[PDB]
Structure formats: C-alpha cells, structure tokens
Amino acid sequence: KYIIPTIMLMPLTWLSKNNMIWVNSTAHSLLISFTSLLLMNQFGDNSLNFSLLFFSDSLSTPLLILTMWLLPLMLMASQHHLSKENLTRKKLFITMLISLQLFLIMTFTAMELILFYILFEATLVPTLIIITRWGNQTERLNAGLYFLFYTLAGSLPLLVALIYIQNTVGSLNFLMLQYWVQPVHNSWSNVFMWLACMMAFMVKMPLYGLHLWLPKAHVEAPIAGSMVLAAVLLKLGGYGMLRITLILNPMTDFMAYPFIMLSLWGMIMTSSICLRQTDLKSLIAYSSVSHMALVIVAILIQTPWSYMGATALMIAHGLTSSMLFCLANSNYERIHSRTMILARGLQTLLPLMATWWLLASLTNLALPPTINLIGELFVVMSTFSWSNITIILMGVNMVITALYSLYMLIMTQRGKYTYHINNISPSFTRENALMSLHILPLLLLTLNPKIILGPLY
Amino acid sequence: KXXXXXXXXXXXXXXXXXXXXXXXXXXXXXXXXXXXXXXXXXXXXXXXXXXXXXXX
C-alpha cells in the first residue's frame, strides 16, 4: 500500500525520455502522498498492527505524512540546480531521493528496534552522496565526514545495546509484544546500557554538546535547498526516543536528569550565537538546534502532557524550518551568496515573496494556534510539573525566538540593494508554489490538530 | 624312529584348543564404558515455524 509504488519511481525516471523526467517524478509522487492520508489515520483505542513485521502501523506517528508531504517538495526547489549538468546526472540524484523516501517510510512504519536500527543508519548513506556532491562552496568533506563520524560514532553502540536486551528479555520485535520488560534496578553496570540507547539519538536530535553535526550540514549546502529539507527529515528521523524511553527504561529517569540540564543550556547559548551570524542559512541552522532541543526536554520528563508537545513539535519544525530553507534557497539562486547583509531587499524587488517571508518567520513564534502553539507551549506547561524553576530559563528563550525571525526579516527589509543588480524576476510559478505548499498544510491543521499530536490523544 | 617329520612348506596357521582354561574372552584393560552412548532422538522435523533472526 505504501512500499512498492515508492519503489516503482526508480524505473519511472530512467525509462522516461530526456525532455520529461521532472514532470513524471513530481506528479506521480503527489497521488501516493494522497493515499497515505487515506488509510494510515484509522485507529482504535490502541493502534492495531498493520500486517506481518516488515512495515507496521502507526501508533503515535503522523510524522510519516510529513515525509510524504516533502516527497514531491524535495524536487521542486532542486529544479534551479542540476539543470546545467548532464541528463544522466539528473536521473541519479532524483533516485537518491527516492531511495531516501524508501528508507524513511520504513523507519516510521515498522514497529521494531532490531530491524529499525538497520534502517536508522541506512538513511545516512544516500544523504552522504547528496552532501559530498553538488556543493557550490568548498569544505564538502569537512562536513561530509562530520556527517557520519558524529552519527555513526553514537549509533554503533546500539548493536551492543539492543541485542543485549533481546538475549536476556524475550525479544524486541513488534513493540506490541514488548511488555516482558521489567524496570531497571539502577546500578553502575546499568549506566552504559542506558547511555548506548540515548547517545545514538543525542546526535540526530542536537543538544549543547555534540551539536556541531547540524550546522556543518546546513551551511555547506548539498543541492540548492531541496536536499536541506531531507536534513530536516533526519532530525525527526530519530523518533525512536519516543519508543525507547517509554518501553525499555521506564524506571530510569535519574540518569536523564543531567541530560535535561545540558539541553536546557542548549537553548540560551544556541540562541545567542543565532543573532550576530553572517550566513542566512546558518541563522536557520542554529534556530533548528534550539527548536529540536525543546523535544529532547519533553521526552526525558516522561509525563503524558509532554509527549503531546513532543509529537506536535516534530511536525511543527518539519514544515517551518524546511519553509525557511526554501526562502534561503530563493535568495541563493539570485544573489549567488548565502550572506545576509549583501542579500538585502524585500517588497521593492520581491513583492509577493515578502508575505511568505513574514508567514514563515512568525510561525517560529507563538502565533494563533497553527501547530507551534500546540508544540512549544505544551512543553513549557509540562516543565512546571517537573520543576518550578524551568520557566525562568524557558521564558528568556521565548524572547530570543523573536530574535531568530525578526533579525532575518529586518536585515532583508531594507529597500536599498545598491550593489545588487540581479534578481529581475521576483519568483517563478514553481517558486511561489513552494512557499504555499509549506504553510497552507499547517493552516489546515488549525481546524483539527488531532492528526498532529496523538500519543493517546 | 617315529620322531622324524618334515615341515615341507609352511604351517599356514593351525587351530587347536582342548584345555581352554577359564575360557577367557573379556579382560583387556578397560573397566567402564564411560557415560555410555550419547542421547540422540529421531522423529524427523516437520518445518520449524519462524527463523531465529530478526528478519522473518
């Protein structure tokens, strides 16, 4: 139903003639994404298994729909790039997205941990080839090696973690079978059992320490801006933290206490740097650290209210940051540099794109209930039940959330553009369509956000 | 005399027993069989449902 038509996209791009390609890859992907919303949404009290354990049902994952939403969107902004080069090279880097889409569906669907692991690290391989090629600026390798040697250094300890559980306590498999799990006795030998399961997800979900994996991937741009949307998918691709903390270690939260404090300082210091920075893409790269840091806080509290805010923020950030990177790509295709100060001029030269700049920026702040108000505020409300002191630190962060958005606006809202002579056409029909396909799905979530936050909702 | 007898060719191994003396068949050196034969069951396996590996 989900896999197989996604695999049939591979012979589609190769068999089709050289003049077409892009028409077939975008149109056929849109009708598969419609059918994902058609079937997956149906659930009872406890979400019942789909079929045999190859790809399973969704329990608290409306985040699969987001991957299906970007399934055509990862092709729209990449149209400006790749067109100058060979026809065979075009077909190759569409199929690498199809392979990404193939593995990303498998991660969220399959209710597992053993076979989930060999799909968790499997997403890293197509993205590596994507990042190491087509990079306009240098140091592709000083970002490409850092892309793996941060993730794989933390995720390979899952082999000594997950297998150790199934050898002693039944088997991991279905997760719906996982009620054999007894609470951990909390000892010095049990410390490295908890750390190995966490450190894998501590990298993909960026903190204060070991966070430099993310800005290197964003600043050194893979292809245009459509591949940066797949880098947003990798942040939310480490969703297994929702599953491990609840099932594998329920009694263990004493060792979570130092890791919350690390992520709490990964909110003030990560935001402060995201103010005086030069690169336009970097000012989204560091705001994406703090926005995903909110989720890590929520997971380690383990309260039923926090998971509501956690699941909301995974979808909230997945369509707001990707929206911001498309705006960064739209300036990168015209000015040919990612500098914020040089690329200056909205409304006067970009009349209709400036309204899309406003809607994308304000969504980072707490607007009328779209998704981020259901995302951020739910975590802040849940942190007070943990400790009273939190909102004194969390409130300061709410001031600097404006300082990501408004500083990106103001440093482009000056109608000077004396040095710049380019950017004659404001936006193509596809470029304005990109901006609408990110905000309007969130505007439809205003009416019913039940399919935006659902761990026992 | 009747003492003279020629060998001619060969003895070719001659077998003769009359006295026997206690018969003597089993002595050797060994005292015990040691743990006997190992337990092995035969019934023929049907199919065996589900593989041991994670992928099934």
Side-chain angles (χ1 to χ4, degrees), chain A residues 1-41 44 50-413 415 426 429-447 449 454-455, chain B:
Chain A
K1 287 185 182 183
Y2 305 94
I3 52 143
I4 291 148
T6 322
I7 316 167
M8 287 298 281
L9 286 153
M10 160 72 182
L12 174 76
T13 50
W14 285 80
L15 200 80
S16 59
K17 59 180 180 178
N18 294 298
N19 291 108
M20 298 295 182
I21 310 158
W22 292 99
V23 64
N24 295 296
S25 60
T26 51
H28 285 287
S29 59
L30 278 154
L31 61 98
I32 311 300
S33 64
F34 178 75
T35 51
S36 66
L37 198 81
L38 199 84
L39 289 149
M40 194 58 83
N41 283 296
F50 202 87
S51 291
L52 285 156
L53 206 63
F54 201 84
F55 76 104
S56 191
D57 74 309
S58 166
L59 268 75
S60 61
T61 319
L63 195 54
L64 186 82
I65 315 296
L66 188 137
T67 319
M68 300 296 277
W69 261 108
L70 287 159
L71 146 79
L73 276 165
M74 285 182 283
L75 295 156
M76 316 305 197
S78 61
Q79 198 71 59
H80 196 96
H81 217 273
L82 304 154
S83 189
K84 290 174 183 178
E85 278 77 51
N86 288 48
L87 293 150
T88 47
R89 292 184 201 177
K90 292 178 190 181
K91 294 177 191 75
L92 279 156
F93 278 79
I94 290 160
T95 49
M96 292 320 290
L97 288 154
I98 294 154
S99 69
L100 256 164
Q101 284 144 11
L102 207 150
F103 283 106
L104 276 156
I105 287 160
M106 285 289 195
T107 49
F108 296 111
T109 48
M111 288 293 298
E112 219 168 331
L113 290 163
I114 335 147
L115 203 138
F116 169 73
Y117 169 74
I118 52 99
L119 300 157
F120 177 79
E121 293 180 324
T123 51
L124 293 158
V125 186
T127 37
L128 176 79
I129 308 152
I130 276 158
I131 291 154
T132 51
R133 212 193 281 260
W134 316 98
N136 297 297
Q137 266 70 46
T138 48
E139 64 271 306
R140 297 189 208 168
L141 320 177
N142 290 304
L145 291 159
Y146 277 79
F147 182 75
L148 292 182
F149 282 87
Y150 259 104
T151 321
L152 280 157
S155 59
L156 279 162
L158 275 173
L159 279 159
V160 291
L162 297 157
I163 305 298
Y164 188 77
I165 308 150
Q166 70 160 63
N167 286 335
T168 52
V169 190
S171 56
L172 301 167
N173 52 35
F174 263 91
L175 266 88
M176 297 292 281
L177 194 81
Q178 268 195 283
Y179 297 108
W180 293 70
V181 187
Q182 288 175 305
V184 192
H185 298 273
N186 193 64
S187 295
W188 290 106
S189 59
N190 294 301
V191 175
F192 286 90
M193 195 185 78
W194 186 87
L195 286 164
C197 282
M198 286 283 100
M199 210 75 79
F201 294 87
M202 292 291 101
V203 180
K204 280 200 182 286
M205 302 263 277
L207 308 150
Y208 178 70
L210 303 154
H211 80 287
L212 212 127
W213 168 76
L214 199 76
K216 287 277 176 74
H218 293 314
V219 173
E220 278 77 56
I223 319 159
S226 261
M227 311 298 109
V228 199
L229 327 173
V232 174
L233 281 155
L234 291 154
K235 287 187 277 289
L236 49 93
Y239 91 112
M241 212 161 78
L242 284 140
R243 305 276 165 85
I244 288 154
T245 323
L246 176 63
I247 307 298
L248 285 168
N249 37 63
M251 202 71 182
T252 317
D253 65 294
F254 193 83
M255 280 192 276
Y257 172 78
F259 279 91
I260 307 149
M261 207 165 285
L262 193 81
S263 60
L264 277 159
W265 266 119
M267 281 283 282
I268 308 105
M269 304 296 277
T270 55
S271 59
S272 62
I273 182 164
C274 198
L275 264 151
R276 212 199 276 241
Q277 276 188 303
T278 50
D279 300 301
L280 196 85
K281 288 182 86 72
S282 194
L283 276 139
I284 315 153
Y286 274 89
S287 67
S288 58
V289 179
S290 61
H291 264 260
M292 294 301 280
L294 284 144
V295 198
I296 311 154
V297 174
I299 297 302
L300 304 161
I301 306 156
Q302 285 174 288
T303 46
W305 266 88
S306 66
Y307 288 108
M308 302 282 179
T311 47
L313 270 159
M314 298 286 265
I315 304 160
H317 190 73
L319 281 156
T320 48
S321 64
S322 59
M323 174 52 206
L324 283 155
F325 277 119
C326 283
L327 290 166
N329 187 31
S330 68
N331 295 309
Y332 194 80
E333 64 189 63
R334 304 281 171 185
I335 292 99
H336 298 275
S337 60
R338 60 180 76 93
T339 317
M340 183 175 68
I341 317 151
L342 185 67
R344 196 168 78 257
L346 291 170
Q347 279 178 48
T348 52
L349 286 150
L350 305 148
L352 206 133
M353 208 200 283
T355 51
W356 298 117
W357 258 106
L358 284 150
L359 288 155
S361 57
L362 300 178
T363 37
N364 288 54
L365 282 155
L367 275 171
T370 47
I371 190 151
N372 283 258
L373 186 60
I374 319 149
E376 282 187 299
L377 189 84
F378 274 62
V379 181
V380 193
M381 283 186 282
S382 191
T383 46
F384 186 74
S385 61
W386 176 268
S387 57
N388 306 319
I389 332 148
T390 41
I391 323 159
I392 310 153
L393 285 154
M394 288 281 273
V396 177
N397 300 314
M398 292 296 282
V399 191
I400 325 153
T401 45
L403 288 162
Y404 315 135
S405 61
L406 305 166
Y407 210 92
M408 280 281 278
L409 287 159
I410 288 152
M411 290 292 283
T412 46
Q413 271 191 303
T429 44
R430 58 164 185 91
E431 282 286 297
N432 290 311
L434 269 145
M435 313 309 176
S436 57
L437 279 158
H438 278 286
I439 304 158
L440 282 154
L442 307 170
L443 285 158
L444 285 160
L445 286 155
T446 59
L447 290 154
Chain B
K1 211 186 274 180

